[PDB]
Structure formats: C-alpha cells, structure tokens
Design a protein around this motif. Structure first.
Motif, PDB file in Angstrom:
ATOM      1  N   UNK A   1       0.844  -1.188   0.000  1.00  0.00           N
ATOM      2  CA  UNK A   1       0.000   0.000   0.000  1.00  0.00           C
ATOM      3  C   UNK A   1       0.886   1.248   0.000  1.00  0.00           C
ATOM      4  N   UNK A   2       1.930   1.275   0.837  1.00  0.00           N
ATOM      5  CA  UNK A   2       2.835   2.409   0.953  1.00  0.00           C
ATOM      6  C   UNK A   2       3.652   2.629  -0.320  1.00  0.00           C
ATOM      7  N   UNK A   3       4.061   1.547  -0.993  1.00  0.00           N
ATOM      8  CA  UNK A   3       4.755   1.618  -2.271  1.00  0.00           C
ATOM      9  C   UNK A   3       3.853   2.259  -3.330  1.00  0.00           C
ATOM     10  N   UNK A   4       2.605   1.783  -3.429  1.00  0.00           N
ATOM     11  CA  UNK A   4       1.607   2.296  -4.357  1.00  0.00           C
ATOM     12  C   UNK A   4       1.311   3.779  -4.097  1.00  0.00           C
ATOM     13  N   UNK A   5       0.985   4.114  -2.846  1.00  0.00           N
ATOM     14  CA  UNK A   5       0.568   5.445  -2.424  1.00  0.00           C
ATOM     15  C   UNK A   5       1.713   6.455  -2.517  1.00  0.00           C
TER      16      UNK A   5
END
Length: 34
Positions: free
Chosen positions: A30-34
């Motif tokens: 999620x953090x990579x995407x966001x």
C-alpha cells in the motif's frame, strides 16, 4: 495520507486474519503504491 490510502492502512492494520508477515507486506505494498 489521502483518505483512500489512509483507509487502506487503517483497514490493513485492523485485519488480524492476515498474520505478521502478510500484514506488514500488505502495509508495505500500500505504501509503495501510495
């Protein structure tokens, strides 16, 4: 974080159906995407 990402983290944290590795990996993804 923006509401979408914020809610994704919040949900992922409060989801013990996922174990330590799975949950931390989910947060990471999620953090990579966001």
């Amino acid at each position: 974080f923006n509401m979408q990402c914020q809610r994704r983290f919040y949900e992922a944290l409060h989801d013990p159906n996922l174990n330590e590795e799975q949950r931390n990996a989910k947060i990471k993804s999620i953090r990579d995407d966001c």
